[PDB]
Amino acid sequence: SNTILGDLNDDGVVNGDDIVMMRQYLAGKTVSGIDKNALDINGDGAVNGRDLMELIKKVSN
């Protein structure tokens, strides 16, 4: 199971590569290797810019 909050490519770490996937997904691209279950970062039931912003916050921290 994916136990890393924000690890959209399932490589163990949360970094800029996950931000790119989140951005491409929100744009409507088909992202290779993305974990769609990890997109709702804040767990509010939707996938939107707020999830992207919390992902950017986690990476900066």
Next chain:
Amino acid sequence: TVKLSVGTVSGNPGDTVKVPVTISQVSTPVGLICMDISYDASKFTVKDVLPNTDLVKDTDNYSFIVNTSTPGKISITFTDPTLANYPISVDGILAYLDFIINSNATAGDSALTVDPATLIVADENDKDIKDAASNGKITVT
């Protein structure tokens, strides 16, 4: 209260029309905007959705995301990738919506509606900013 407003435009069937989306009453620097604008897909096709780079900075680092994959809905997301250096801090035009009017479109008004349930405006720390939305329309002539 920060306000996201869709403008109005008139055009003949077959014409390409441009509609501005404006933000006003800005004070707290804005780090995040999520808004959805619905339109009549039987009458209009989205040609593009372009940011006003005079106000929306760092578009080269993907600060302005558009999604038009769902018929009749435009989703616009602004995020400051730096969380500090490229906020929206003044009033102005956020983006321009270019529509192509179907050559068989009927005359009359057609609303451009902002979804209040999904509208988000927040500061650089992802804290909510009191917001409101104002709808626009296209008038086929």
